[PDB]
């Protein structure tokens, strides 16, 4: 199960943010025009309406994936390994073939 962590979005104000490609898992960078960022305490930048917001979204394993994980394998062919108990003349022999 993945984690799909989304970082803090990048803002530039009266300026562009053409996103740079990255090698992270399922990277998605996308640019937003006409945004007005606003956290608590007031509007977060000067530029009135021509703002660019680079929104970033990649994906990552969950912290608990070290236990609940599924491993994919190929199976080509299987060969027996049998343990044989052979007794003869009051003498025993346990051996793997």
């Amino acid at each position: 199960k993945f984690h799909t962590v989304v970082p803090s979005p990048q803002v530039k104000c009266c300026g562009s943010l053409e996103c740079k490609a990255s090698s992270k898992a399922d990277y998605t960078c996308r640019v937003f025009g006409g945004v007005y960022p606003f956290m608590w305490g007031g509007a977060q930048c000067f530029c009135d309406s021509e703002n660019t917001q680079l929104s970033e979204a990649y994906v990552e394993f969950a912290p608990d994936c070290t236990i609940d994980h599924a491993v994919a394998l190929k199976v080509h062919t299987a060969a027996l390994k049998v343990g044989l108990r052979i007794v003869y003349g009051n003498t025993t022999a346990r051996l793997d073939t």
């Binding site: 199960k1 993945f2 799909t4 989304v6 979005p9 090698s23 992270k24 898992a25 399922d26 998605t28 996308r30 937003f32 945004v35 007005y36 960022p37 606003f38 956290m39 977060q44 917001q53 929104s55 970033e56 979204a57 994906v59 990552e60 394993f61 994936c65 070290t66 994980h69 599924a70 994919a72 394998l73 199976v75 299987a78 027996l80 049998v82 044989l84 052979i86 003869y88 003349g89 003498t91």
Partner: protein
């Protein structure tokens, strides 16, 4: 394939070259406050967990007990083994004894 098993893949748990197609979609924000609105397909691992069927410890033919580390099938009969034995001459005794 998004929304199915194998949507996120990696060679190891601690590996860095993680590849994924989770069908993540970035949406233009609507409210004045800051947030990154993303719509994503559900985890294919969870869907496969919910629709796993029964494992091979409960459906393997011939009564084969499936065990792991290593992957193997133990203690089941499905045929005949022609065994050739070279019994030493010390085991035999003469007919007069």
């Amino acid at each position: 394939n998004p929304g199915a098993f194998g949507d996120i893949q990696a060679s190891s748990l601690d590996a860095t070259d993680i590849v994924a197609r989770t069908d993540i979609r970035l949406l233009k924000p609507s409210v004045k406050n800051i947030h990154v609105p993303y719509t994503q397909a559900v985890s294919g691992y969870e869907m496969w967990k919910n629709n796993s069927g029964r494992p091979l410890q409960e459906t393997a033919p011939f009564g084969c007990k499936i065990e792991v580390e290593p992957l193997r099938a133990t203690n089941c009969a499905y045929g005949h083994i022609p065994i050739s034995i070279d019994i030493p001459d010390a085991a035999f005794v003469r007919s007069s004894e």
